[PDB]
Design a protein around this ligand. Structure first.
Ligand SMILES: COC1CCN(C(=O)NCC2CC2)CC1
Ligand SMILES: [Cl-]
Length: 115
């Protein structure tokens, strides 16, 4: 069901190396609905190539637009299993400190802060 379940560590590592080769300015991001989630839709896809200069605050706006949310729906975005310390950090900086050992940056969203 989840991305890590669908692809071998080898396949995830090689895909990241290829994004490096072909999409060198992009951060490879996996974005997944919380398995417990009732309110928010699932995304049309899992793997997002994010320009490396956008900050976390803009990536939240992008995903809320991708989900076609309205002003008073709640949306929480976990990175590498935990709350974002700050929405102002550029995603290039977030990648270097929060990337998985496979080379992807793993995110999960819910309507609840208590996932
Ligand atoms: C904000 O992230 C989304 C942008 C679209 N995307 C791309 O693949 N980018 C376009 C270009 C061919 C690589 C990943 C999802
Ligand atoms: Cl690029």
């Amino acid at each position: 069901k989840t991305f890590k379940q669908r692809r071998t560590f080898e396949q995830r590592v090689e895909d990241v190396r290829l994004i490096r080769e072909q999409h060198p300015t992009k951060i490879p991001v996996i974005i997944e609905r919380y398995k417990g989630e009732k309110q928010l839709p699932v995304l049309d896809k899992t793997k997002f190539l994010v320009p490396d200069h956008v900050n976390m605050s803009e990536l939240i706006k992008i995903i809320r637009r991708r989900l076609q949310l309205n002003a008073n729906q709640a949306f929480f975005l976990l990175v590498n299993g935990h709350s974002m310390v700050s929405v102002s950090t550029p995603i290039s900086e977030v990648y270097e400190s929060e990337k998985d050992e496979d080379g992807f940056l793993y995110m999960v969203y819910a309507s609840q802060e208590t996932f």
